Point group: C3
Chain length 266, copies 3
C-alpha cells in the first residue's frame, strides 16, 4: 500500500467538515445500479475529483443521504483493477468510511451467471467468494500491516454476514417476488475481456455461481477494519458453456436494498 493512515484520516476529516451527514451504512453501487442514489433524501453529492486523496461505467460521485430512514453514503461508481488501479487504490474509500464511523458496508455488482439454474434478472445474495487475484498475491492488504485498521492475518470465512443474509431472505419474502432470491459464491477475475468457454467451465467446476471483475478487494478491506458486510450480484447475463431484463432487475435491487436499511442493526 502507498497510503498512510493519516491520508485516510485527512479525507474522512475533509468529508466530515463538508456535510452534516453522519452515515452508519456505506453502499458501493456497481454496474447499472447508479440509480439508487435517486432514492436518497437530504442528498449531498461530491464528485470523486473534488475529494482530497480519492482515486480519480458510472458517475464517479459520492452521495450522502437518508435511505428508508437510515443515514448512508453511496459510491455511484467504483474503481476497477482493469482500469489500471492497484487494489490499495480501489479500496481507499472503504477505510475512509470506517473513519467516518460507518459500521456496515453493502456491496453490489453485475455478474455473469455460472450456476445453470440462474436466469438473467436474478439477484444473487453473495454467500462466499473466491479471490483469484488474491491466490497470486494481488491483495489490498499486501504490504506492512496497519494495526490501527486491523490484524496482520484476517479471517475471511465469515465475510458475508449471516444475520444480514437471513434478513435478506425474509425481506425478499415480504416483497412477494415470484422468483426466489438466489445465493452463492462470487468469483473475481481481473478482466477486462469476457471469458472463454473453457474458462467458464473451469470457474463453474471451482464451485463459483457468478463471475465478475470487482467487489472482493472491497470486502477484504472492509472485514480487515471490522465492517459488517453483505452484498448482491445482479445476473445480467447467463454465460455460454458450449462451443434488458437487467434494467427491471436493477430497479428491483434498488427497492430491495432500500427495504433492507430497516434490518441493519443499530
Amino acid at each position: 500500500n502507498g497510503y498512510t493512515y493519516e491520508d485516510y484520516q485527512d479525507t474522512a476529516k475533509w468529508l466530515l467538515s463538508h456535510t452534516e451527514q453522519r452515515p452508519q451504512v456505506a453502499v458501493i453501487c456497481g454496474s447499472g445500479l447508479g440509480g439508487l442514489v435517486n432514492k436518497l433524501t437530504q442528498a449531498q453529492t461530491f464528485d470523486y475529483s473534488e475529494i482530497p486523496n480519492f482515486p480519480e461505467g458510472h458517475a464517479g460521485r459520492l452521495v450522502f443521504g437518508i435511505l428508508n430512514g437510515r443515514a448512508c453514503v453511496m459510491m455511484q461508481g467504483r474503481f476497477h483493477m482493469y482500469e489500471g488501479y492497484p487494489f490499495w487504490k480501489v479500496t481507499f474509500p472503504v477505510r475512509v468510511f470506517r473513519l467516518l464511523g460507518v459500521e456496515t458496508l453493502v456491496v453490489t455488482n453485475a455478474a455473469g451467471g455460472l450456476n445453470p439454474n440462474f436466469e438473467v434478472g436474478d439477484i444473487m445474495l453473495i454467500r462466499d467468494h473466491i479471490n483469484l487475484p488474491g491466490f497470486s498475491g494481488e491483495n489490498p492488504l499486501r504490504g506492512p500491516n496497519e494495526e490501527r485498521f486491523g490484524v496482520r492475518f484476517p479471517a475471511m470465512s465469515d465475510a458475508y454476514d449471516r444475520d444480514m443474509r437471513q434478513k435478506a431472505h425474509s425481506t425478499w419474502k415480504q416483497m412477494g417476488e415470484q422468483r426466489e432470491l438466489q445465493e452463492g459464491t462470487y468469483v473475481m477475475l481481473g478482466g477486462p475481456n469476457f471469458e472463454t468457454v473453457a474458462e467458464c467451465r473451469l470457474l463453474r467446476n471451482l464451485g463459483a455461481d457468478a463471475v465478475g471483475m470487482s467487489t472482493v478487494p472491497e470486502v477484504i478491506v472492509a472485514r480487515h477494519c471490522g465492517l459488517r458486510v453483505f452484498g448482491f450480484s445482479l445476473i445480467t447475463n447467463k454465460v455460454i458453456m458450449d462451443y434488458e431484463a437487467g434494467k427491471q432487475a436493477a430497479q428491483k435491487l434498488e427497492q430491495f436494498v432500500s427495504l433492507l436499511m430497516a434490518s441493519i442493526p443499530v
Copy 2:
C-alpha cells in the same frame, strides 16, 4: 499500458517507409518454428533492435515476404513474460500489424501435452484457451481503454476463428497425414520453470489439453483490435502425471501454415 496510440502509429509508419511489402497476414513463430521465414519469397528482414519502439530462443527479427502467394509479415521469435516483459510490451507488435493493415494473425508455439491421447510430434489446432495470468489481472488490456483499437470489454469466447479451424482440418486431410490433426484448449502459465506433477494434474483437470508460457496475450490484443486469429501448438513433450520428433513436426507445421495461406479470406 505505457504506449500511446501514436507510438504504435510511429512504428507502423516507419515500417511502411522501409518496405514496399503490404502484408495482410501476420505470423508469430514460436519455439523451433523460426525456420518458416526461409520459405518466404521477396523477403525483407529487420532485426527488432532496428525498429523504433520494438521491445528489445529465436532470432529477434521481423521478416516481410510472400508465402504461397500471400503477403505476410513474420515474427521470428516472440517476447515472453518470464523474460521480465509486461504484456503491454509482449503484445506491442500485434497493434503495429493492425496499423499496417494486417487482417489475420496466425500464432504458433511449442507446448507440453496434457491430453493423454497426445504424442510428441502432434500438432494441436488451438480451439480455446485458459488465461491463468488474466485471472489475477495480468492482462495486456489493463489500463484505460484505447477506443481507436477496440471496446472496453471484448468477448473472447470466439477468439479462435471457426472458419479457419474448418480450413485447417480440410487442408490437413489434403496433406495425407497418417496422424490426425489434434485440437484443444491451450493454458498459459508464467514460467520459466517447468511444472510439477501436481500442477500438471490440476491443469489437466481444468480442461487444458496443452500447457505453454506464451501466445494468449497476443490473441487477446489481436481480438480486441479486430484481427481474425488462428493458431497451433507443436506438442514437443508429453507431460509426466505420475510421481527430436519435435524437428520433423516443426517442418510439418511449416508446410501446413504455408498451405493454409491459400485458405485465408481476401
Copy 3:
C-alpha cells in the same frame, strides 16, 4: 530480478569474512519453529539488518552453528510476499547460501490442513507443490536468466529430493512416534488473509494437502541453482470446509530436523 550476481557474491564474501563456520546445509525456519536455533553448538548470530544486501513473526536473524554434528546456517524467520516483498527479494538468501558452498536446503513452514485425514500437530513431509502465484507469472526467476546460477527453464517435478524423503520416513520410525508421518502437496497462495470455505474446497479439489503463504519461491530458486531440497509443513490448523498442539509439534519437528542432519549426504 533487481540483484546482480555480484550483489549475492558481496554478501556471501562478507559472511565468509565474519565467521569461521562453513555450512553445507541451510535451514529456513517458518512460523513457530524459530526455536531450532537453540539446539546449535558454536552458534554465531547476525541480525538481518547487519548483513549487507539482506532484505530488512520471527527473529529476523541468521544463525550459523553445528546441529547434530553438521555445519548449518539457519534463517530464524523468513521474508513474505504479503509483507510487500517481490520474490526476488524473498529468495535473496537462497543464492547467498549456494555461494557459501551450501549443498542442501531444508524448508519448514506452518500450514492449514486440507487433507481430511490430517490433524492439528501433524507433520507433513512436502512431496510436491502447487505454485499459484507462479501460474500468473509472479516468479523469483522472472527476468533475464543468470546462467552462473542455472538454466533458463528449470524442471520442478523432482524438486523434493526422493532420497531425503526415504530418510525422513525411516528416521520418523526410529523416533517411535505413534502418529504416522504425513506427506503431500503444499499449495502456496499470497495472503495475508485466511481463506474462505469456497477457496478451501477449491484448493482441496486441486489436489492440495496443505495451504500456506510461503516456501515455494525458495524451493524454485534452490532447485534452479542446484541445491538438494526437502521440507516439512507443521499442520497448526485444520481448515473448515463447511458453511496449542502446534507447540508440541513444533518441538517434535525441531528434534526431527536435528536427527535428519545425520542422513544428509556428504
